[PDB]
């Protein structure tokens, strides 16, 4: 029965705050010192009642319903058993709010917003006020003994909550005791020893005063020992077991508090005996713990030397291999200071500095993890660089000046560029082979992230790059060969680009550094090299007008552009595919347009105009063959098409006729007499562009436009005359490669022009009984018999080119050329499959507007099942 009733009360009991809990959990402006004076005074009056209130406060903070009674705490030999019973009661409670930590992590949502701050303040000062009331020293005071007797068993029990709050109470005690021991030393005993040593002479030692000094010096040291005694204990009872608690949060509190003991009291704590704890938890399975140790190490940076000798390896491994990027990044940050300190071997340095190179696109403006990780690697790189500089210049005196800049600058640039290249070489070993293109793009990117550290070298890199003399002197990577120049300009371009996309930077800064040298750079770099052309034009294209006027260099833009146009003029351009030059020039032309200055536009408008004039010359003089097409395309047609993307190109009746009659319509005869490599570069892309510009006129209205219609009608007739020649039984070159290539490239431009025309025609209102009538007048039917026949032959060539790669057996119409069974062609950029799909897509596009002979082109489906999944997809 007695037991029944106890079980009964246990069951119907609900959560009731104790008095001390209430004041601590709800007071928003509390004098915690007055509070402690009251409680600690009560200890001396009624020990049991204080102890009870203390533990019940702990129980309230964990949201426990259970409570001790004054008799429960009467005996200190009961403590383990009683905590045992509390543990039983608290395990039985199904639901429990951890108020202390809800206050901490969720003040806004918490029933007791101030509870956490008050609780840590209270337990942190507890032991100070104890001292004020002479409860601490008295041999250890029984206050302390009492407190440890109950905190110890609670700190190792099976309830995480009780374990956390006891451990935190113990640690808060130690925050103070550790401060207090040194306090006693440096501020009391030291002050009294001095005055024990100065009141010794002159042969007049006060003797009664030399007795009062040894007296309090002896008291104070006795109490320094009682204090260290409790410090030893809390380590022995708590930290040494709690640092590896199964709960990660008690482990991180252990690291946070040990760091404080270390700052408070290094003579006790700055020793490998305690630092190992950080190093061990470096291998903790929890991301949170590894993060927490890693944030503590910088603060902590001979005990420390021994520490990094023992743990740097693990720190390196984290920065390289850790499953968590935020952690990896933290590691790199620690490695900054280890390097700064000389604790890193050279191979260990490279393994980190080469991390600045990464295959993935990482944006320099982002606040993401990836971006912040590269940024902390750039920080490491910056520090290695500075160390090497000091090491290099340590004995040396350099000249006031090397290679047109301060000696010290030239060295810094040479050391930087050298580490950049050593680092790259490492990166490149750590991964599968990549081509020069990807190589440059990855370097370009690293340079972006280095802008915050090497940005002040931008001006001197420009000047070093325009130096005419030899790169030596009585003593480093310098722009001495062609690979080193490319490294320099890519790195200049990446630095500069990174500087204009860096967030939070004031306007015009990168421009203040490069625009003064930009004319000289274009005037002097080896821009015949497309890699060098790409980097310098890329620098040019970084800047908006506001950049040029601000810097005072708006005046230079035209002379620079003139150089750009002369380099444009001196080159030979290919049809655009994978041509680094075509791409650089194209972007430059766009950029200039985008600046919006008529004076500049005119430089390009006049260039188009000269090109036209000279083409007409070439046309009437030279076409009255491999050389002819080489020149035609290399010096005239590919360049008008490039410029044509940005500025209007129009052939006037005269030139257009010259071009259509002497070239375009004679393409079949011209082609039979060229070499393969020359046939490969034959196309009519310019004809599609001329058209597009006219279509632009027509849409920039919607009253028809005459000669503008005569122009495109005439361009299309030209396509017809080719298709007639090409599809006729008189074509003795039918069936050959060269014949396929011409049919194919001619078809691609034709399809683009016709689709463009039909989409326009359908976008004119019935309202427009003059436009609609004139379009059908000139173009309908859009695709003629011979055009249908050529597109089908082109399709069939591509289909067998892809089929044959796997020796697939195609079905065929009865008079379908069976020689298609043997065709082979290695000449396509990204493979036969790609060209089959694209052509078939262009054919689908026509079919959807229904411009194709549906009966004829049913044929594209005959082998859908033989051609793989993609083709089959495009057919659906």
Numbering used by the authors: 88 to 225, 235 to 397, 408 to 581, 605 to 753, 761 to 838, 849 to 1022
Sentences from the paper on this structure:
Sister chromatid cohesion involves entrapment of sister DNAs by a cohesin ring created through association of a kleisin subunit (Scc1) with ATPase heads of Smc1/Smc3 heterodimers. It has roles in loading of cohesin onto chromosomes as well as its subsequent release.
To obtain the structure of a more complete version of the protein, we expressed Scc3 trimmed of its N- and C-terminal extensions from other yeast species. Of these, Scc3 containing residues 88–1035 from Zygosaccharomyces rouxii (Zr Scc3) yielded crystals suitable for crystallography. Diffraction data were obtained to a resolution of 2.6 Å from crystals grown at pH 6.5 in a PEG/KSCN condition and their structure solved by selenomethionine single-wavelength anomalous dispersion (SAD). At the tip of the nose reside three conserved basic residues, KKR (298–300). The highly conserved positively charged residues Zr K340, K372, and R416 all protrude from the surface in a conspicuous manner.
